[PDB]
Amino acid sequence: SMSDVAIVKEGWLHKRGKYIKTWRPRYFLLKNDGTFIGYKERPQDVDQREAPLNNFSVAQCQLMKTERPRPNTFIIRCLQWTTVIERTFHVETPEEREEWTTAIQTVADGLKKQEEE
Numbered sequence: 001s002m003s004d005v006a007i008v009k010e011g012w013l014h015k016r017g018k019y020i021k022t023w024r025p026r027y028f029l030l031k032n033d034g035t036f037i038g039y040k041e042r043p044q045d046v047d048q049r050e051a052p053l054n055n056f057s058v059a060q061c062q063l064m065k066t067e068r069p070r071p072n073t074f075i076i077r078c079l080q081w082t083t084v085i086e087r088t089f090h091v092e093t094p095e096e097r098e099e100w101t102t103a104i105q106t107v108a109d110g111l112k113k114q115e116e117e
């Protein structure tokens with residue numbers, strides 16, 4: 001339950017439009033349970049956390065790193081019921097990128113191990 005109610009990583013990143021190719025600021029939270037919730041601003045109190053901007057599952061995903069159109073870009077491709085969603089993000093260093101990427105992967109491995117048994 002409670003590990004399964006925790007926050008793995010949170011912080012700001014750039015999120016690119018699907019179609020309108022602009023980077024936009026989002027405060028994101030990586031949850032143990034596999035949800036990835038994003039916000040316009042860093043969610044102030046608890047009450048603000050309850051109106052998110054972005055919401056997807058990242059248990060069952062591919063973590064890909066790219067250097068276009070910006071260095072330290074990454075793409076998350078994650079299964080979402082019957083379809084995949086792909087989302088493109090950006091951070092200032094490859095080391096930040098590598099930390100975000102490794103943390104997402106940590107959440108997914110957590111749950112792949114639970115599905116196995």
Ligand SMILES: O=P(O)(O)O[C@H]1[C@H](O)[C@@H](OP(=O)(O)O)[C@H](OP(=O)(O)O)[C@@H](OP(=O)(O)O)[C@H]1O
Nearest residue numbers: 015016017018019020021024026053054055087
């Ligand atoms: O702005 P454009 O390029 O037209 O494409 C939008 C944005 O990328 C949205 O990201 P953001 O909401 O951060 O602005 C995204 O929301 P999600 O990534 O949360 O799904 C929309 O997905 P849909 O509403 O799901 O179709 C996608 O259609």
